[PDB]
Enzyme design. Structure first.
Site, PDB file in Angstrom:
ATOM      1  N   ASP D  16      -9.148  19.477 -18.861  1.00 36.26           N
ATOM      2  CA  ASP D  16      -8.878  20.789 -18.270  1.00 36.26           C
ATOM      3  C   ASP D  16      -8.918  21.905 -19.313  1.00 36.26           C
ATOM      4  N   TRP D  46     -16.827  -5.434  -2.148  1.00 38.59           N
ATOM      5  CA  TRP D  46     -16.453  -5.107  -0.783  1.00 38.59           C
ATOM      6  C   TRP D  46     -17.666  -5.065   0.180  1.00 38.59           C
ATOM      7  N   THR D  58      -9.260  -2.415  -0.807  1.00 34.66           N
ATOM      8  CA  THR D  58      -7.801  -2.419  -0.960  1.00 34.66           C
ATOM      9  C   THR D  58      -7.236  -0.999  -1.076  1.00 34.66           C
ATOM     10  N   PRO D  59      -7.153  -0.303   0.044  1.00 36.75           N
ATOM     11  CA  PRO D  59      -6.625   1.051   0.030  1.00 36.75           C
ATOM     12  C   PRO D  59      -5.182   1.058  -0.476  1.00 36.75           C
ATOM     13  N   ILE D  60      -4.814   2.204  -1.080  1.00 38.89           N
ATOM     14  CA  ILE D  60      -3.476   2.421  -1.644  1.00 38.89           C
ATOM     15  C   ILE D  60      -2.520   2.992  -0.635  1.00 38.89           C
ATOM     16  N   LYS D  89       1.702  -8.336   3.356  1.00 39.08           N
ATOM     17  CA  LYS D  89       0.419  -7.672   3.531  1.00 39.08           C
ATOM     18  C   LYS D  89       0.111  -6.794   2.321  1.00 39.08           C
TER      19      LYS D  89
HETATM   20  C1  LIG Z   1      -2.984   1.147   5.186  1.00 45.51           C
HETATM   21  C2  LIG Z   1      -2.257   1.229   6.522  1.00 45.51           C
HETATM   22  C3  LIG Z   1      -3.229   1.360   7.706  1.00 45.51           C
HETATM   23  C4  LIG Z   1      -1.339   0.016   6.691  1.00 45.51           C
HETATM   24  O1  LIG Z   1      -0.670   0.215   7.908  1.00 45.51           O
HETATM   25  P1  LIG Z   1      -0.480  -1.101   8.880  1.00 45.51           P
HETATM   26  O2  LIG Z   1      -1.708  -1.833   9.256  1.00 45.51           O
HETATM   27  O3  LIG Z   1       0.139  -0.531  10.075  1.00 45.51           O
HETATM   28  O4  LIG Z   1       0.517  -2.199   8.270  1.00 45.51           O
HETATM   29  P2  LIG Z   1       1.855  -2.056   7.556  1.00 45.51           P
HETATM   30  O5  LIG Z   1       2.534  -0.793   7.881  1.00 45.51           O
HETATM   31  O6  LIG Z   1       2.631  -3.223   7.909  1.00 45.51           O
HETATM   32  O7  LIG Z   1       1.610  -1.937   5.994  1.00 45.51           O
HETATM   33  C5  LIG Z   1       1.133  -3.089   5.293  1.00 45.51           C
HETATM   34  C6  LIG Z   1       1.988  -3.263   4.073  1.00 45.51           C
HETATM   35  O8  LIG Z   1       2.035  -2.049   3.262  1.00 45.51           O
HETATM   36  C7  LIG Z   1       3.335  -1.842   2.879  1.00 45.51           C
HETATM   37  N1  LIG Z   1       3.498  -0.398   2.682  1.00 45.51           N
HETATM   38  C8  LIG Z   1       2.989   0.620   3.444  1.00 45.51           C
HETATM   39  N2  LIG Z   1       3.412   1.822   3.031  1.00 45.51           N
HETATM   40  C9  LIG Z   1       4.224   1.544   1.935  1.00 45.51           C
HETATM   41  C10 LIG Z   1       4.955   2.376   1.073  1.00 45.51           C
HETATM   42  N3  LIG Z   1       4.981   3.686   1.199  1.00 45.51           N
HETATM   43  N4  LIG Z   1       5.662   1.778   0.083  1.00 45.51           N
HETATM   44  C11 LIG Z   1       5.629   0.416  -0.038  1.00 45.51           C
HETATM   45  N5  LIG Z   1       4.980  -0.434   0.715  1.00 45.51           N
HETATM   46  C12 LIG Z   1       4.273   0.183   1.686  1.00 45.51           C
HETATM   47  C13 LIG Z   1       4.108  -2.334   4.099  1.00 45.51           C
HETATM   48  O9  LIG Z   1       5.499  -2.498   3.814  1.00 45.51           O
HETATM   49  C14 LIG Z   1       3.439  -3.684   4.288  1.00 45.51           C
HETATM   50  O10 LIG Z   1       3.750  -4.539   3.218  1.00 45.51           O
HETATM   51  P3  LIG Z   1       4.248  -6.022   3.445  1.00 45.51           P
HETATM   52  O11 LIG Z   1       5.671  -5.945   3.701  1.00 45.51           O
HETATM   53  O12 LIG Z   1       3.521  -6.629   4.565  1.00 45.51           O
HETATM   54  O13 LIG Z   1       3.955  -6.803   2.135  1.00 45.51           O
HETATM   55  C15 LIG Z   1      -1.470   2.543   6.663  1.00 45.51           C
HETATM   56  O14 LIG Z   1      -0.406   2.585   5.710  1.00 45.51           O
HETATM   57  C16 LIG Z   1      -2.310   3.732   6.201  1.00 45.51           C
HETATM   58  O15 LIG Z   1      -3.304   4.054   6.817  1.00 45.51           O
HETATM   59  N6  LIG Z   1      -1.925   4.380   4.962  1.00 45.51           N
HETATM   60  C17 LIG Z   1      -2.931   5.342   4.498  1.00 45.51           C
HETATM   61  C18 LIG Z   1      -3.947   4.696   3.544  1.00 45.51           C
HETATM   62  C19 LIG Z   1      -4.723   5.806   2.826  1.00 45.51           C
HETATM   63  O16 LIG Z   1      -5.343   6.675   3.429  1.00 45.51           O
HETATM   64  N7  LIG Z   1      -4.659   5.694   1.388  1.00 45.51           N
HETATM   65  C20 LIG Z   1      -5.273   6.786   0.647  1.00 45.51           C
HETATM   66  C21 LIG Z   1      -6.776   6.696   0.667  1.00 45.51           C
HETATM   67  S1  LIG Z   1      -7.424   5.025   0.627  1.00 45.51           S
HETATM   68  C22 LIG Z   1      -9.197   5.207   0.183  1.00 45.51           C
HETATM   69  C23 LIG Z   1      -9.305   4.760  -1.228  1.00 45.51           C
HETATM   70  O17 LIG Z   1      -9.072   5.522  -2.149  1.00 45.51           O
HETATM   71  C24 LIG Z   1      -9.656   3.363  -1.512  1.00 45.51           C
HETATM   72  C25 LIG Z   1      -9.713   2.932  -2.838  1.00 45.51           C
HETATM   73  C26 LIG Z   1     -10.085   1.598  -3.094  1.00 45.51           C
HETATM   74  C27 LIG Z   1     -10.396   0.721  -2.018  1.00 45.51           C
HETATM   75  O18 LIG Z   1     -10.818  -0.595  -2.300  1.00 45.51           O
HETATM   76  C28 LIG Z   1     -10.294   1.172  -0.686  1.00 45.51           C
HETATM   77  C29 LIG Z   1      -9.938   2.494  -0.430  1.00 45.51           C
HETATM   78  C1  LIG Z   2       4.757  16.629 -21.596  1.00 47.67           C
HETATM   79  C2  LIG Z   2       5.416  16.029 -22.830  1.00 47.67           C
HETATM   80  C3  LIG Z   2       4.755  16.508 -24.134  1.00 47.67           C
HETATM   81  C4  LIG Z   2       6.915  16.339 -22.823  1.00 47.67           C
HETATM   82  O1  LIG Z   2       7.440  15.694 -23.953  1.00 47.67           O
HETATM   83  P1  LIG Z   2       8.564  16.518 -24.829  1.00 47.67           P
HETATM   84  O2  LIG Z   2       8.174  17.856 -25.324  1.00 47.67           O
HETATM   85  O3  LIG Z   2       8.808  15.627 -25.961  1.00 47.67           O
HETATM   86  O4  LIG Z   2       9.948  16.727 -24.046  1.00 47.67           O
HETATM   87  P2  LIG Z   2      10.763  15.780 -23.175  1.00 47.67           P
HETATM   88  O5  LIG Z   2      10.487  14.366 -23.470  1.00 47.67           O
HETATM   89  O6  LIG Z   2      12.149  16.139 -23.369  1.00 47.67           O
HETATM   90  O7  LIG Z   2      10.303  15.924 -21.663  1.00 47.67           O
HETATM   91  C5  LIG Z   2      10.610  17.140 -20.975  1.00 47.67           C
HETATM   92  C6  LIG Z   2      11.206  16.772 -19.649  1.00 47.67           C
HETATM   93  O8  LIG Z   2      10.345  15.862 -18.897  1.00 47.67           O
HETATM   94  C7  LIG Z   2      11.132  14.874 -18.363  1.00 47.67           C
HETATM   95  N1  LIG Z   2      10.286  13.686 -18.215  1.00 47.67           N
HETATM   96  C8  LIG Z   2       9.339  13.212 -19.084  1.00 47.67           C
HETATM   97  N2  LIG Z   2       8.818  12.047 -18.678  1.00 47.67           N
HETATM   98  C9  LIG Z   2       9.466  11.779 -17.475  1.00 47.67           C
HETATM   99  C10 LIG Z   2       9.359  10.714 -16.568  1.00 47.67           C
HETATM  100  N3  LIG Z   2       8.539   9.701 -16.751  1.00 47.67           N
HETATM  101  N4  LIG Z   2      10.151  10.752 -15.468  1.00 47.67           N
HETATM  102  C11 LIG Z   2      10.999  11.809 -15.288  1.00 47.67           C
HETATM  103  N5  LIG Z   2      11.166  12.839 -16.076  1.00 47.67           N
HETATM  104  C12 LIG Z   2      10.359  12.788 -17.157  1.00 47.67           C
HETATM  105  C13 LIG Z   2      12.186  14.684 -19.449  1.00 47.67           C
HETATM  106  O9  LIG Z   2      13.296  13.914 -18.982  1.00 47.67           O
HETATM  107  C14 LIG Z   2      12.592  16.133 -19.657  1.00 47.67           C
HETATM  108  O10 LIG Z   2      13.246  16.627 -18.516  1.00 47.67           O
HETATM  109  P3  LIG Z   2      14.614  17.413 -18.608  1.00 47.67           P
HETATM  110  O11 LIG Z   2      15.660  16.413 -18.683  1.00 47.67           O
HETATM  111  O12 LIG Z   2      14.610  18.292 -19.781  1.00 47.67           O
HETATM  112  O13 LIG Z   2      14.738  18.256 -17.309  1.00 47.67           O
HETATM  113  C15 LIG Z   2       5.164  14.515 -22.932  1.00 47.67           C
HETATM  114  O14 LIG Z   2       5.810  13.834 -21.855  1.00 47.67           O
HETATM  115  C16 LIG Z   2       3.702  14.186 -22.638  1.00 47.67           C
HETATM  116  O15 LIG Z   2       2.828  14.563 -23.391  1.00 47.67           O
HETATM  117  N6  LIG Z   2       3.408  13.504 -21.393  1.00 47.67           N
HETATM  118  C17 LIG Z   2       1.969  13.455 -21.107  1.00 47.67           C
HETATM  119  C18 LIG Z   2       1.511  14.653 -20.262  1.00 47.67           C
HETATM  120  C19 LIG Z   2       0.116  14.354 -19.701  1.00 47.67           C
HETATM  121  O16 LIG Z   2      -0.838  14.073 -20.420  1.00 47.67           O
HETATM  122  N7  LIG Z   2       0.054  14.465 -18.264  1.00 47.67           N
HETATM  123  C20 LIG Z   2      -1.212  14.076 -17.660  1.00 47.67           C
HETATM  124  C21 LIG Z   2      -2.274  15.124 -17.867  1.00 47.67           C
HETATM  125  S1  LIG Z   2      -1.672  16.812 -17.830  1.00 47.67           S
HETATM  126  C22 LIG Z   2      -3.172  17.853 -17.625  1.00 47.67           C
HETATM  127  C23 LIG Z   2      -3.140  18.329 -16.220  1.00 47.67           C
HETATM  128  O17 LIG Z   2      -3.581  17.644 -15.314  1.00 47.67           O
HETATM  129  C24 LIG Z   2      -2.527  19.627 -15.917  1.00 47.67           C
HETATM  130  C25 LIG Z   2      -2.458  20.054 -14.590  1.00 47.67           C
HETATM  131  C26 LIG Z   2      -1.897  21.317 -14.320  1.00 47.67           C
HETATM  132  C27 LIG Z   2      -1.420  22.133 -15.384  1.00 47.67           C
HETATM  133  O18 LIG Z   2      -0.912  23.417 -15.095  1.00 47.67           O
HETATM  134  C28 LIG Z   2      -1.468  21.662 -16.712  1.00 47.67           C
HETATM  135  C29 LIG Z   2      -2.032  20.418 -16.983  1.00 47.67           C
END
Ligand SMILES: CC(C)(COP(=O)(O)OP(=O)(O)OC[C@H]1O[C@@H](n2cnc3c(N)ncnc32)[C@H](O)[C@@H]1OP(=O)(O)O)[C@@H](O)C(=O)NCCC(=O)NCCSCC(=O)c1ccc(O)cc1
Ligand SMILES: CC(C)(COP(=O)(O)OP(=O)(O)OC[C@H]1O[C@@H](n2cnc3c(N)ncnc32)[C@H](O)[C@@H]1OP(=O)(O)O)[C@@H](O)C(=O)NCCC(=O)NCCSCC(=O)c1ccc(O)cc1
Ligand SMILES: CC(C)(COP(=O)(O)OP(=O)(O)OC[C@H]1O[C@@H](n2cnc3c(N)ncnc32)[C@H](O)[C@@H]1OP(=O)(O)O)[C@@H](O)C(=O)NCCC(=O)NCCSCC(=O)c1ccc(O)cc1
Ligand SMILES: CC(C)(COP(=O)(O)OP(=O)(O)OC[C@H]1O[C@@H](n2cnc3c(N)ncnc32)[C@H](O)[C@@H]1OP(=O)(O)O)[C@@H](O)C(=O)NCCC(=O)NCCSCC(=O)c1ccc(O)cc1
EC number: 3.1.2.23
Lengths: 140, 140, 140, 140
Positions: D16, D46, D58-60, D89
């Site tokens: 970025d 697939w 394997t959708p997420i 599942k």
């Molecule tokens: C996927 C599904 C249809 C499943 O629904 P379902 O058929 O009714 O079945 P069910 O609700 O029982 O879910 C199946 C399992 O997922 C688990 N699950 C679902 N949601 C959650 C959640 N939020 N946290 C944890 N587990 C979850 C659920 O508990 C069950 O697990 P298990 O207890 O059987 O081990 C529904 O959750 C859904 O449509 N979610 C949206 C999916 C979606 O759009 N994902 C983002 C885009 S996917 C496009 C993609 O990037 C991709 C990448 C790679 C690839 O190979 C395929 C696609």
């Molecule tokens: C960001 C930082 C430098 C902060 O580290 P730091 O200066 O040492 O300070 P510190 O560790 O105290 O973290 C600051 C805060 O983050 C909190 N924090 C850090 N990691 C976590 C975590 N895993 N879960 C929860 N809180 C977290 C931390 O607890 C503290 O919160 P608070 O208690 O003060 O409220 C370090 O975590 C790091 O470099 N992480 C990687 C960042 C990165 O590469 N992210 C992915 C790409 S970012 C590129 C991007 O997409 C973007 C999009 C939009 C935009 O406007 C800018 C960039």
């Protein structure tokens, strides 16, 4: 001319609903191959050139591309990049993308002639510069 | 010719380290504008055309693009798309991308002439078809 | 809390071979909605904040996302973004993504709780800062 | 558990305006590493599973990610992927992303626990299935 080659694997997410590479992805790969050419030729990364001499990179000014055949995930593409012509401030960078059939046959997938320039950011204004002589030498 | 216009806001993530739109993003937008043209002209979505008549969409076979000036996040682009020429199996789709200065001045940002075709997927093989007469009519 | 809403149309290229939105695209949209929230709240663009006070933006440190139902091209998503909690140097930004059925029924598509921080680039080193009081006020 | 590793080079366009990897890119890489795990474990692509048994991939359904340190173009990331838990599942797929310092020191860059499911497309409706026993065996 001096040609640099690189490989690129196509991923599921790089494909569209039609099951083939979504075209903008080829440009992402062409851009990586363009930079890869310069890195392999010995230029420093833009992060360094910007500090040293103000060069931010080689933005594109024009492109002519043709898509010959399709490609899909798991296909391994081979990209061949060279500089076709050095102009004054611009240069023509050609990229040939191919893939191999299990026949050991090499199929042309796509090709593009990109016209780019070395540039600097003068504040918010991008500005092209004459191609650095030292860079021409590294790429030769 | 019948022109369709659409807007596109540039996002921070659409820019590169040089702070301007990373070029492949323009192609993503050109692809959306291409499809938007057909949808606005009345064709059904490809999801439906594939079931009805086998048409998977309009894959690109060639492109000629030029980048005139830079753009960055928060800039709102205006894309104008039209069909420049109907050939036999192919068509030339032109896209003009502009942005406005706060002067009310319209600046050309980039332009591209895309050559595409209506196609079908015969199994794994993509195949172009003669431009459907009904589609030409909808787009006229 | 103060919620900002924005719309996002899904494009053909944003979908995978399975015909639905390829997941990384949701993160692109979440990132645009995150920044849109701050812009709408009155903060200046990062291009300006970096010059003024060194703030480069709000990089992400953590994320918890759930995908509830699928979405595809032509679907118009509605994203609702708010700040769930202000910590010290970090903040939790929540995003709810929905789409509408032609029933006038609103379906939840996905949701994500992003943890971000305001940061500066000290040379090559990213560094988080305490959330600016003035920013908290603009967002309230 | 059975771990598969893969490398990923970061490109200029993957960064970025702040000069570091734009986050959605990590998800693109996580998705490629997820599929790479299954391919390396012996499952068919697939494209083939959909024909054979209806499996589209394997959708997420959920994700928990943390970003530990930044990365930029030219950095070579190492991604380690394993299945943390088989549910009914769903399954939890863990990915650890690191990069190496020239010190030979391995720095953790980011990590994500993805929850996915094997699914089928029943017409337009995505549907999860119980994890195939044969797949569990290949991945063991
Ligand atoms: C996927 C599904 C249809 C499943 O629904 P379902 O058929 O009714 O079945 P069910 O609700 O029982 O879910 C199946 C399992 O997922 C688990 N699950 C679902 N949601 C959650 C959640 N939020 N946290 C944890 N587990 C979850 C659920 O508990 C069950 O697990 P298990 O207890 O059987 O081990 C529904 O959750 C859904 O449509 N979610 C949206 C999916 C979606 O759009 N994902 C983002 C885009 S996917 C496009 C993609 O990037 C991709 C990448 C790679 C690839 O190979 C395929 C696609
Ligand atoms: C960001 C930082 C430098 C902060 O580290 P730091 O200066 O040492 O300070 P510190 O560790 O105290 O973290 C600051 C805060 O983050 C909190 N924090 C850090 N990691 C976590 C975590 N895993 N879960 C929860 N809180 C977290 C931390 O607890 C503290 O919160 P608070 O208690 O003060 O409220 C370090 O975590 C790091 O470099 N992480 C990687 C960042 C990165 O590469 N992210 C992915 C790409 S970012 C590129 C991007 O997409 C973007 C999009 C939009 C935009 O406007 C800018 C960039
Ligand atoms: C780049 C520039 C500022 C150059 O304008 P300038 O300083 O006034 O100079 P000038 O017009 O003389 O152009 C320099 C050269 O380009 C040549 N040129 C410019 N446009 C064209 C064209 N359409 N066809 C052929 N040659 C062209 C021009 O003839 C001259 O060549 P030469 O005769 O000196 O050999 C202006 O054309 C412009 O801003 N175009 C827009 C650039 C743009 O936004 N490209 C898309 C995004 S670039 C972001 C990106 O993806 C990227 C990737 C990698 C990287 O390392 C850096 C960036
Ligand atoms: C598309 C095709 C199968 C056509 O081959 P074909 O069935 O044998 O037929 P044919 O060669 O006669 O080509 C059809 C027409 O294209 C014209 N054409 C083909 N190549 C060119 C070229 N380089 N320059 C000008 N015209 C060309 C050709 O002259 C003929 O036109 P016309 O005289 O009939 O008016 C073959 O060129 C091919 O596979 N090219 C690769 C296509 C490709 O992979 N494009 C990149 C990815 S496409 C994925 C995508 O992003 C997408 C976006 C939107 C959408 O709705 C669908 C897909």
């Amino acid at each position: 001319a001096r040609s640099i080659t690189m490989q690129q694997r196509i991923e599921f997410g790089d494909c569209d609903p039609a099951g083939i590479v979504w075209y903008p992805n080829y440009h992402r790969w062409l851009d990586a191959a363009s930079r890869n050419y310069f890195i392999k030729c010995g230029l420093p990364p833009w992060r360094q050139t910007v500090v040293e001499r103000g060069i931010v990179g080689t933005p594109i000014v024009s492109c002519n591309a043709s898509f010959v055949c399709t490609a899909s995930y798991d296909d391994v593409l081979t990209i061949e990049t060279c500089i076709k012509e050095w102009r004054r401030k611009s240069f023509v960078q050609r990229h040939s993308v191919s893939r191999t059939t299990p026949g050991g046959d090499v199929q042309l997938v796509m090709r593009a002639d990109e016209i780019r320039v070395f540039a600097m950011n003068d504040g918010e204004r991008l500005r092209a510069i004459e191609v650095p002589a030292d860079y021409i030498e590294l790429c030769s």
